[PDB]
């Protein structure tokens, strides 16, 4: 029963494997060979943001291109104005080890979570003055490593208990639950049409999901170690990953195989966070060796280095208009590049 | 007009900045301690005084913060990484023994935990179990330079000094001197185990300063 079940599946692997090669027609490096690069184009630290004590583990941008949110192990969420560098708000927390945070595209709720196995939802409308917690979503057993917002009513979370679980805040319970992965789920990014999403997991894999159907759509395995950073292309057709072995990859959501890898022999630490430029040409990623790295997506060539930091980075992102790119790192410092 | 907010934000920002200056220093009031292991009775006898359990206590007007993980998954390689700000790791033991070595060893060789110190606690006063595990235990001399616990059979005290020296040939095996282990046996004794920590966190924060002045 089990011996045939392993026997059919390795044939079902080869049923997918050699049929995956049926669309392997050329390479991406063969067919971008004509374009000029962007060249050595380097940003500059425009502002610097200093309010945090402990290591800033995660940030998230705004939908207005004006504000951003950040959290660190001291236990403070803080909403930073990017323009004047004036802090809009500060929130105490009951746990400390906030491993992720999120900023809704209504601008009226923010959220966070961590080793407390609880995804707090915070209110920013605040008819009485300061902020307060709306509720919290205790339906997990591992920890929470990423969370995102669909509207002001439902959020999708990552997991230390292998199961990405989408919520509904008025119910306060999981509508659905995705039990596909094997290890830990680190990062997830929402699609540009808020309909699908992918999730990077600790088994060198990522499974495309659906928030309506709840099935497991696809699976992409090309990494050698656990994945930590994963984000969508702006068009809605591709996503680029980064694992803990200094390999940035590229896949496609139609061809269903990988396209382009990004590596260099002088980089030995692991990738931590990733983001994309507005026009999708430039790929940006940070590392553990205390500096960022800006890549072309097409030629697979490093084109920018943002070396202002002096501890390991953990979180970054390009704004929705692409006006700037901000990074955070374990020295509690937030550098905004342009 | 445009500067109507400039009397708000600056006078809101300095409300935040005056608020955090109580918290920049009360962070330095306490000392974080990560307590971990694989066991229950030795782990829930230091609860003498969810997702993660949390307690707090103070001695000699100095307050501590123990953070023992409760409902957590057995794969440890990603929620260990958020624990290098801790002043000291308390590691409690309770063939558990050889498997407890690599749970200590791979902490000691971890890239992010290189700069943090490890306290220890030996429970489980075991004789047939030890030479069943390690063959070269029969070769062992009891340390006489180390005083024994007075009034005990010298095979009981000898195996106590086998594992205590087994960690130390792993701890000092190319540690280079950025962090120091602190072996202690308090096997299920209704005693302090507080001054045996309060003195030994002090030796950690002492040797950090002499390290910063290039004196160690």
């Amino acid at each position, epitope marked *: 029963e089990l011996d045939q079940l392993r026997q059919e599946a390795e044939q079902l692997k080869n049923q997918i494997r050699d049929a995956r090669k049926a669309c392997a027609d050329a390479t991406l490096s063969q067919i971008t060979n004509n374009i000029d690069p962007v060249g050595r184009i380097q940003m500059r630290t425009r502002r610097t943001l200093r309010g945090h004590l402990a290591k800033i583990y995660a940030m998230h941008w705004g939908t207005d291109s004006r504000l951003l949110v950040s959290a660190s192990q001291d236990g403070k969420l803080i909403i930073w104005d990017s323009y004047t560098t004036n802090k809009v708000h500060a929130i105490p927390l009951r746990s400390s080890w906030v491993m992720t945070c999120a900023y809704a595209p209504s601008g009226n709720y923010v959220a966070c979570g961590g080793l407390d196995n609880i995804c707090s939802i915070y209110n920013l409308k605040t008819r009485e003055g300061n902020v307060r917690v709306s509720r919290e979503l205790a339906g997990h057993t591992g920890y929470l490593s990423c969370c995102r917002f669909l509207d002001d009513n439902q959020i999708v979370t990552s997991s230390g208990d292998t199961t990405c679980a989408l919520w509904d805040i008025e119910t306060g319970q999981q509508t659905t639950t995705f039990t596909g992965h*094997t290890g830990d789920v680190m990062s997830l990014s929402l699609a540009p049409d808020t309909r699908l999403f992918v999730s990077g997991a*600790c088994d060198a894999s990522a499974k495309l999901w659906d928030v309506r159907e709840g099935m497991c759509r696809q699976t992409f395995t090309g990494h050698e170690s656990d994945i930590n950073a994963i984000c969508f292309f702006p068009n809605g057709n591709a996503f680029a990953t980064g694992s803990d072995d200094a390999t940035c990859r590229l896949f496609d959501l139609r061809a269903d195989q990988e396209l382009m890898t990004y590596s260099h022999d002088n980089i030995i630490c692991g990738i931590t966070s990733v983001s994309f430029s507005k026009s999708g040409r430039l790929l940006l990623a940070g590392y553990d060796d205390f500096n960022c790295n800006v890549w072309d997506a097409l030629k697979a060539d490093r084109a920018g280095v943002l070396a202002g930091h002096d501890n390991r980075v953990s979180c970054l992102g390009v704004t929705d208009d692409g006006m700037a790119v901000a990074t955070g790192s374990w020295d509690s410092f937030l550098k905004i590049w342009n | 007009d445009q500067r109507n907010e400039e009397k708000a934000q600056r006078e809101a920002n300095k409300k935040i900045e005056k608020q955090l200056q109580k918290d920049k220093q009360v962070y330095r009031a306490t000392h974080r301690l990560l307590l971990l292991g694989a066991g229950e009775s030795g782990k829930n006898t230091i609860v003498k005084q969810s997702g993660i359990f949390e307690t707090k206590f103070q001695v000699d007007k100095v307050n501590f913060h123990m953070f023992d993980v409760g409902a957590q998954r057995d794969e*440890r*390689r990603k929620w260990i990484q958020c624990f290098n700000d801790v002043t000291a790791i308390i590691f409690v033991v309770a063939n558990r023994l050889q*498997a407890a070595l690599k749970l200590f060893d791979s902490i000691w060789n971890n890239k992010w935990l290189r700069d943090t110190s490890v306290i220890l606690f030996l429970n489980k006063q075991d004789k047939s179990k030890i030479e*069943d595990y390690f*063959p070269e235990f029969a070769r062992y001399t009891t340390p006489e330079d180390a005083t024994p616990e007075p009034g005990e059979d010298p095979r009981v005290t000898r195996a106590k000094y086998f594992i205590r020296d087994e960690f130390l040939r792993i701890s000092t095996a190319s540690g280079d001197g950025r962090h120091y282990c602190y072996p202690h046996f308090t096997c299920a004794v209704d005693t302090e185990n507080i001054r045996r920590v309060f003195n030994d966190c002090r030796d950690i924060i002492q040797r950090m300063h002499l390290r910063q002045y290039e004196l160690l």
Partner: nanobody
Amino acid sequence: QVQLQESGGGLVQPGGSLRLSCAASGFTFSNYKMNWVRQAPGKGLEWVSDISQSGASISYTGSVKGRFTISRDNAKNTLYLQMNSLKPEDTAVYYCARCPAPFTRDCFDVTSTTYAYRGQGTQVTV
């Protein structure tokens, strides 16, 4: 792709001798430190042996000291383990595991809950 295949197992009466090669592919084998693990029926898992990246440092569990040897062939990415002078209390399901990260000797892999880089398993009957 992470595929940790094995070759061995079988009947042994106490005093026999047998080998184990863990053939595996999918990554740069020279950048990884490799290690074995068994589990008795009725007990948990326990680390038995390892090897470093170069092959220099070698360690064993005390109860299996001097009776097993562990090596690799980094050219054709295998993992050779030789079992000599068998003992009746060593019948257990074995695995061939990999430490998660490259370039560093720290490992957290003995756990039960589907560690992502242990093989499909073997079985020995002593």
